[PDB]
């Protein structure tokens, strides 16, 4: 596997996590670890790079709030633009799946 497909898959995952509601970097990593039965351990540095780009693109926004130990935490939200990006990304992967399915079928024929 090359960086690009892993990175593409991570991006798809992060958008689907943020779709569910506001979140923070360490909480996202925890949830993805749990949803992967412990196998996918995303690195916070990867999220920082991704979230920087998405914030610039207008796909996510952020705000500050409290956290439990008494400090301050940056929270992230999928914007309206970001919800459309999420839909297009999901649509695009489904179109790619269909192209390959059709390739395999036109072959058998």
Interface contacts to a second copy, rule CB under 8 A: 1-2, 4-9, 11-13, 16-17, 20-21, 31-32, 34-36, 39-40, 57-59, 81-82, 84-85, 88-89, 92-93, 95-96, 99-100, 102-104, 106-107
In the list a second copy, Cu ion, none, the entry touching 70 (Cβ below 5 to 8 angstroms by class) is none
CB of 99 to Cu ion, least distance (A): 9
The DSSP code for 23 is B
In the list a second copy, Cu ion, none, the entry touching 43 (Cβ below 5 to 8 angstroms by class) is none
Rg of the chain over Cα atoms, rounded to whole angstroms, equals 17
CA distance linking residue 95 with residue 89, whole number of Å: 10
Helix axes 44-57, 80-108, angle to 10 degrees: 110
Helix axes 44-57, 3-19, angle to 10 degrees: 70
Closer Cβ to a second copy, 37 or 70, answer by number: 37
In the complex, which residues of this chain contact Cu ion (CB under 5 A)? 97
């Amino acid at each position: 596997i090359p960086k690009e497909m892993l990175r593409a898959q991570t991006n798809a995952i992060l958008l689907n996590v943020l779709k569910q509601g506001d979140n923070y970097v360490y909480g996202i990593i925890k949830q993805v670890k749990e949803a992967s039965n412990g196998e996918m351990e995303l690195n916070e540095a990867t999220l920082y790079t991704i979230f920087k780009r998405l914030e610039k693109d207008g796909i996510i926004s952020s705000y500050w709030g409290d956290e439990s130990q008494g400090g301050r935490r940056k929270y992230y939200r999928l914007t309206e633009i970001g919800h459309e990006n999420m839909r297009l990304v999901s649509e695009s992967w489904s179109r790619v799946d269909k192209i390959i399915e059709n390739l395999e079928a036109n072959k058998k024929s």
